[PDB]
Write a protein that binds this ligand. Structure first.
Ligand code: HEM
Ligand code: HEM
Ligand code: HEM
Length: 71
């Protein structure tokens, strides 16, 4: 429900929105241009300092391609 699925050509990439809404405070970290869609998203950030960035740093979360890219 509140969750969000991102159709991927290598397996859907589940992303706990509501969950990340309880784990992370400031949303500007994800919604720099205010809450909404992120025109430009993709492997780009999803890989760089997008998701893996706020993951590896703490060493927690889908850091492998078998975690994000894996229906
Ligand atoms: C070295 C491991 C990884 C490889 C080789 C990899 C490869 C790719 C590739 C090739 C794409 C482009 C798909 C396309 O648009 O045709 C992509 C997109 C994406 N990746 Fe990764 N990825 C890896 C790990 C991750 C991880 C760990 C996450 C989640 C934290 C992630 C999240 C995404 C998302 C959300 C997209 C955009 C949706 C899509 O177009 O599939 N990736 N990745
Ligand atoms: C004030 C807190 C937040 C609000 C109000 C919010 C709201 C939204 C809304 C409304 C959408 C989709 C637009 C729509 O359907 O109307 C969205 C998408 C999204 N949100 Fe959040 N969100 C918040 C926190 C977060 C956080 C903390 C992250 C990252 C940890 C995040 C990551 C995303 C991503 C990746 C998308 C998908 C957009 C895309 O496909 O490019 N959100 N958010
Ligand atoms: C669209 C980008 C992102 C995606 C796809 C993503 C995906 C995920 C997923 C699938 C988990 C597994 C946790 C679970 O639900 O059990 C996770 C965990 C986590 N993510 Fe993210 N994430 C993203 C962005 C971020 C950002 C920006 C931050 C920091 C601002 C962040 C911080 C964390 C932390 C700290 C955890 C560990 C869970 C815990 O608190 O135990 N993530 N992430």
């Amino acid at each position: 429900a509140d969750d969000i699925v991102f159709k991927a050509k290598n397996g859907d990439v589940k992303f706990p929105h509501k969950a990340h809404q309880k784990a992370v405070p400031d949303c500007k970290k994800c919604h720099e241009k205010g809450p909404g869609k992120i025109e430009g998203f993709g492997k780009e950030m999803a890989h760089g300092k997008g998701c893996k960035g706020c993951h590896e740093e703490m060493k927690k979360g889908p850091t492998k391609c078998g975690e994000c890219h894996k229906k």
